[PDB]
Design a protein around this ligand. Sequence first.
Ligand SMILES: Cc1cc(C)c2c(CP(=O)(O)O)cc(=O)[nH]c2c1
Ligand SMILES: [Zn+2]
Ligand SMILES: [Zn+2]
Length: 229
Amino acid sequence: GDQRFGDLVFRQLAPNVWQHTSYLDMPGFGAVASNGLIVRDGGRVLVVDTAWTDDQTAQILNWIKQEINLPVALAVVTHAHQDKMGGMDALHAAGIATYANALSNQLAPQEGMVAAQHSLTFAANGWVEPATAPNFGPLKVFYPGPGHTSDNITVGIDGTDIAFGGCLIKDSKAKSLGNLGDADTEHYAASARAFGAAFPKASMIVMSHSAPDSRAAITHTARMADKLR
Ligand SMILES: Cc1cc(C)c2c(CP(=O)(O)O)cc(=O)[nH]c2c1
Ligand SMILES: [Zn+2]
Ligand SMILES: [Zn+2]
């Protein structure tokens, strides 16, 4: 099922959806996997999240060329940390239109990231303002509230059973909530639950650091976050 392509791993999740995985050393603590998504929408490809680095992200584009062979119309990135935005320059070099939460773009320079070209803004109920996400096809972008970071956003794939929680959601057996350095611990539980409520049909939950899981990833993440309050 997993396809090794250089130093990256690709896994098909649905007829038009693949998960990309890349790795970065955290010195003294080992190699950390990060996952994003690749979606074919008719004659074009849409990407969710970069890899950790420009070189890895260019390799994602190379895999897309060889295994899908359609233009990448856009990429959306889900917060201003390296695992999700570290390859922005590679997307720009490839001519790909890039989108992030306005707050992610504001935070990008101080986080050592390059901002996306375009900023998403969100209604008070969390749904993206549609004019800021033109041509997103089946991608439905939702801001669930502050959690893993204040800017974290999430993405559902219409026409599939898949929703992507990024670094907000951990798997159903996870022992911790991971890196809380930029987290909002008071609001985390509610934000995890809001993600679940936004995508009630999503039975396959994709996330940044574990294989896809059932919706027990959402309940378990929220229950762990209850303890932070
Ligand atoms: C201090 C720190 C910062 C980050 C961004 C990480 C990440 C990326 P993430 O916070 O987006 O998951 C993974 C990790 O394992 N440790 C970290 C430590
Ligand atoms: Zn993060
Ligand atoms: Zn993460």
